[PDB]
């Protein structure tokens, strides 16, 4: 290739990135209050409405094995992408709290639109990093319970065990810049792409499992999942090696306070930049709207995104935000 | 001051004063509670145990009682919403997927919750029978006290007040056997903590620190008994005679498999109908069962055994009915 890879430090995984500036802790004894201010049932329902998905009232449809691409936002980074036959899910979280505990931790103010049961045949599942807001043991458990060997768990290096331990066999571990495929539908290609984030689920396990983005290269359309990352070259590299991608899921939340999050989390503007670097035709906007993992107003990220869109000479068509549970079909 | 089984405190914690109790407990361990019922694909359970969408979701109005009657809605396990005398009170609210102190281990419901805390009408009081994780849900407590405030009057047994306050609740009332209180505004309704034969445990060495029991709400139009968790005991004739006749009775009819083991903490359907006769209620509702797997019996068995015991005693399904998850039922009185 020609795009820097990694390449771990003496012991754990470094980002190898320049925008990488230390600062890595937790959320129980530091800048962790908020300014989002979420309250009032009807108010939430109004501002942030939860849409009942289609694969519930009319499962039939599904498939989208046509030639375009259908996407559904089930919260935070939980997006179901119906593309080139395959029906894959990303960073699946269907539980109320994203904490190792049930007594403390972040609880969603906007519940998961559907339930794993209601879910349609899930083919592959993609995992950005190990953070609880992206890895929900309960969710994982259910998935295999329902499906099982027929679930291509595409995971980053350092997760296999966890998966297998949870009770999964169809699991692939990958170092960013690696590649693998869904057995049956081998035509489509999945690639672990780099990113700028951290990995931690317990103590001392810091950056023990790699982080990164996913790039689904399918015969017809192409999709890119960033996950959680701060602005770092890679993106362009990706947009070059692969791309032009069709749709891309870019995080637009958890950015304030900038002085601390900047290096681990992009800002709505930085996202617009990714839209460009990755060379996609459109973007869906992941993270935001579901959990309060920062101090930014919970409604701010879409406003800041449209601000940056108009700054960069773009339009809300190019980088759109879905409603909780909404689907969207893009036939190119 | 008639013969009234009072407490009920031995060594340090409370024992069950009732004669038929024998402590040889072992604690919930999936061992004999994981699957001897073996619930298959959701679909199967959708056919057998359909989850309904409670009335107050589609019609948030209509949710009082207009008096001269009694409305009840079954939300899972032992969660029961009772409306009477300008009062909507909950019992044993569990709206969480798993009934455990952990998120990695414990019994997880196979039937989703009918509604959510955001969707239910104004609750005026919650009743807690005992402290077990299938009847006391931390997240549910929080959610409730987050929606509501000092308007939610939490009626809990003796030894729970501190727990409640530590959750953030301020309008909390602690009661002992045959103890009575009321909702601040509505005085005519009187809530009474009445005996039962169960145990209490959430952590290690806290066994029987808090007390168990049953609730007898005496409103000026409709008397409502709610049993909670219990094996058969004589305190139910006391409850049924002192108060009563009652209009409804939320009786448990599930989790009774290793009769040798669970007979002193959990009634079977036969003892459940025995309960119905004892408390002298006009109607009774089947609670517990169908939601969690807390024993080995087949998950559909308890209603069948309920009907068998009903016809044994010369009663029809009218007197003792089982509802679907989320179904409601209205009961007008003389
Ligand atoms: C005393 C013992 C310790 C008690 C602490 C127990 C409570 C822990 C609460 C953890 C809350 C996790 C919140 C969800 C999560 O993973 O997100 C936080 C972070 C990644 O989130 P991101 O979207 O990247 O941006 C947020 C910016 N901070 O990801 C993380 O912070 C990673 C998770 C760290 C969790 C620490 C807890 C370790 C396990 C404790 C028990 C060990 C004792 C036995
Ligand atoms: C050492 C580490 C220990 C790890 C164990 C952690 C997992 C515990 C799982 C508990 C599952 C509870 C099941 C729900 C529940 O409360 O019901 C069981 C019982 C009352 O249930 P009931 O309907 O009366 O019928 C059951 C028949 N015996 O109620 C009970 O039995 C009460 C629950 C007893 C278990 C207490 C939890 C363990 C202690 C936590 C602190 C440990 C940290 C230090
Ligand atoms: C503040 C209490 C203890 C209070 C005391 O000193 O008595 C301490 C005890 C254990 C500490 C936690 C251990 C894990 C983490 C270590 C980090 O470095 C900061 C965040 C976390 C999540 C800590 C939060 C906080 O620093 C805690 C909860
Ligand atoms: C729940 C127990 C004990 C309750 C009791 O004995 O009454 C208490 C005792 C010590 C408490 C911990 C002290 C350190 C931390 C302090 C924070 O403010 C909340 C999180 C932690 C990690 C606490 C969690 C929890 O509140 C603990 C473990
Ligand atoms: C056992 C009680 C719950 C008792 C109850 O619900 O009444 C719970 C409540 C708070 C829980 C603690 C929260 C902080 C920690 C989180 C970790 O994930 C595991 C260890 C700790 C220290 C937990 C230990 C244990 O899980 C506690 C103490
Ligand atoms: C303890 C239960 C199983 C108990 C039983 O069979 O009854 C097991 C089953 C799945 C196990 C988890 C699998 C994923 C993780 C593997 C890690 O290396 C340790 C932590 C986790 C989160 C494990 C913790 C724990 O060991 C669990 C929850
Ligand atoms: C609290 C027990 C102590 C009991 C024992 O020694 O068995 C210790 C011992 C083994 C410990 C685990 C070892 C594997 C992991 C190492 C991480 O760096 C911290 C989290 C994990 C998941 C640990 C969690 C916790 O710190 C455990 C469970
Ligand atoms: C099975 C392990 C350890 C066995 C070993 O070390 O080989 C033991 C050690 C700690 C034990 C638990 C302690 C807490 C609880 C005490 C109850 O009175 C019985 C259920 C529980 C939940 C116990 C279940 C089980 O007995 C455990 C988990
Ligand atoms: C911290 C990991 C989760 C790690 C992951 O998700 O990968 C979890 C997985 C299993 C969890 C333990 C389960 C058994 C115990 C339950 C008690 O109620 C509190 C202490 C213990 C010992 C728990 C502590 C902590 O909650 C653990 C060790
Ligand atoms: C999660 C850690 C270790 C993780 C690791 O070393 O990678 C493991 C190590 C020891 C494990 C415990 C051993 C005793 C128990 C055995 C049971 O069969 C499941 C529950 C308990 C309470 C276990 C819960 C949990 O699974 C622990 C605490
Ligand atoms: C430690 C958190 C709050 C931490 C924070 O500030 O975020 C507190 C807030 C409410 C606390 C719980 C209140 C009910 C219980 C009281 C018991 O005496 C100890 C266990 C429980 C389950 C407590 C565990 C723990 O002490 C919690 C969960
Ligand atoms: C080790 C700390 C602190 C010791 C102290 O305050 O002296 C203590 C303080 C409170 C203790 C917890 C309180 C709630 C529970 C009490 C149970 O009966 C045993 C398990 C738990 C979960 C306890 C475990 C542990 O023993 C804790 C967390
Ligand atoms: C794992 C888990 N915990 C808790 C809940 C319920 O959330 P809450 O108790 O906050 O209402 C769910 C609901 O689906 C869940 O999946
Ligand atoms: Zn993250
Ligand atoms: Zn995140
Ligand atoms: Zn119980
Ligand atoms: Zn029970």
Swiss-Prot record, chain A:
Annotated binding of Zn(2+) 2, by residue: 133-134, 228, 287
Membrane topology: Peripheral membrane protein
Binding residues annotated for deoxycholate, in chain numbering: 200, 204, 292
Molecular function (Gene Ontology), one example: N-acylphosphatidylethanolamine-specific phospholipase D activity
Annotated compartments: Golgi apparatus membrane; Early endosome membrane; Nucleus envelope; Nucleus, Nucleoplasm
Binding site for an N-acyl-1,2-diacyl-sn-glycero-3-phosphoethanolamine: 132, 265
Cofactor details (free text): Binds 2 zinc divalent cations per subunit.
Tissue expression: Widely expressed. Highest expression in brain, kidney and testis (at protein level). Expressed in adipose tissue (at protein level).
Tagged with keyword Acetylation: yes
Outcome when changing residue 102 to S: Impairs homodimerization resulting in loss of activity
Binding residues annotated for Zn(2+) 1, in chain numbering: 129, 131, 197, 228
Stated regulation of activity: Activated by divalent cations. Activated by bile acids and their conjugates, except for lithocholic acid which is rather inhibitory. Binding of deoxycholic acid favors the selective release of anandamide and likely other unsatured long FAEs. Inhibited by phosphatidylethanolamines.
GO biological process: host-mediated regulation of intestinal microbiota composition; N-acylethanolamine metabolic process; N-acylphosphatidylethanolamine metabolic process; negative regulation of eating behavior; phospholipid catabolic process; positive regulation of brown fat cell differentiation; positive regulation of inflammatory response; response to isolation stress
Highest taxon, organism lineage: Eukaryota
Enzyme class: hydrolase
Cofactor(s) named in the record: Zn(2+)
Cellular component aspect of the GO annotation: cytoplasm; early endosome; early endosome membrane; extracellular exosome; Golgi apparatus; Golgi membrane; hippocampal mossy fiber to CA3 synapse; neuron projection
EC number(s) given by UniProt: 3.1.4.54
Similarity field: Belongs to the NAPE-PLD family.
Subunit structure: Homodimer. Bile acids promote the assembly of inactive monomers into an active dimer and enable catalysis.
Role of this protein: D-type phospholipase that hydrolyzes N-acyl-phosphatidylethanolamines (NAPEs) to produce bioactive N-acylethanolamines/fatty acid ethanolamides (NAEs/FAEs) and phosphatidic acid. Cleaves the terminal phosphodiester bond of diacyl- and alkenylacyl-NAPEs, primarily playing a role in the generation of long-chain saturated and monounsaturated NAEs in the brain. May control NAPE homeostasis in dopaminergic neuron membranes and regulate neuron survival, partly through RAC1 activation.
Name by which UniProt lists this protein: N-acyl-phosphatidylethanolamine-hydrolyzing phospholipase D
Organism field: Homo sapiens (Human)
From Swiss-Prot, chain B:
Cell compartment(s), UniProt: Golgi apparatus membrane; Early endosome membrane; Nucleus envelope; Nucleus, Nucleoplasm
UniProt note on tissues of expression: Widely expressed. Highest expression in brain, kidney and testis (at protein level). Expressed in adipose tissue (at protein level).
UniProt GO cellular component terms: cytoplasm; early endosome; early endosome membrane; extracellular exosome; Golgi apparatus; Golgi membrane; hippocampal mossy fiber to CA3 synapse; neuron projection
Disulfide bonds: none
Keyword flag Lipid metabolism: yes
Enzyme Commission code: 3.1.4.54
Signal sequence bounds: none
Binding site for an N-acyl-1,2-diacyl-sn-glycero-3-phosphoethanolamine: 133, 266
A GO molecular-function descriptor: identical protein binding
Recorded catalytic activity of this chain's protein: an N-acyl-1,2-diacyl-sn-glycero-3-phosphoethanolamine + H2O = an N-acylethanolamine + a 1,2-diacyl-sn-glycero-3-phosphate + H(+); N-butanoyl-1-hexadecanoyl-2-(9Z,12Z-octadecadienoyl)-sn-glycero-3-phosphoethanolamine + H2O = N-butanoyl ethanolamine + 1-hexadecanoyl-2-(9Z,12Z-octadecadienoyl)-sn-glycero-3-phosphate + H(+); N-hexanoyl-1-hexadecanoyl-2-(9Z,12Z-octadecadienoyl)-sn-glycero-3-phosphoethanolamine + H2O = N-hexanoyl ethanolamine + 1-hexadecanoyl-2-(9Z,12Z-octadecadienoyl)-sn-glycero-3-phosphate + H(+); N-octanoyl-1-hexadecanoyl-2-(9Z,12Z-octadecadienoyl)-sn-glycero-3-phosphoethanolamine + H2O = N-octanoyl ethanolamine + 1-hexadecanoyl-2-(9Z,12Z-octadecadienoyl)-sn-glycero-3-phosphate + H(+)
Residues binding Zn(2+) 2: 134-135, 229, 288
Positions of Zn(2+) 1 binding: 130, 132, 198, 229
GO biological process: host-mediated regulation of intestinal microbiota composition; N-acylethanolamine metabolic process; N-acylphosphatidylethanolamine metabolic process; negative regulation of eating behavior; phospholipid catabolic process; positive regulation of brown fat cell differentiation; positive regulation of inflammatory response; response to isolation stress
Stated consequence of mutating residue 202 to A: Impairs binding to bile acids resulting in loss of activity
EC category: hydrolase
Activity regulation note: Activated by divalent cations. Activated by bile acids and their conjugates, except for lithocholic acid which is rather inhibitory. Binding of deoxycholic acid favors the selective release of anandamide and likely other unsatured long FAEs. Inhibited by phosphatidylethanolamines.
Top-level lineage group: Eukaryota
Topological category with respect to the lipid bilayer: Peripheral membrane protein
Cofactor (UniProt): Zn(2+)
Main localization of the protein described in the UniProt heading: Golgi
Quaternary structure, from the entry: Homodimer. Bile acids promote the assembly of inactive monomers into an active dimer and enable catalysis.
Family, per entry: Belongs to the NAPE-PLD family.
Protein name: N-acyl-phosphatidylethanolamine-hydrolyzing phospholipase D
Species whose genome carries this gene: Homo sapiens
Lineage of the organism: Eukaryota, Metazoa, Chordata, Craniata, Vertebrata
Gene that this polypeptide is encoded by: NAPEPLD
Shown residues within the full chain: 56 to 389 of 393
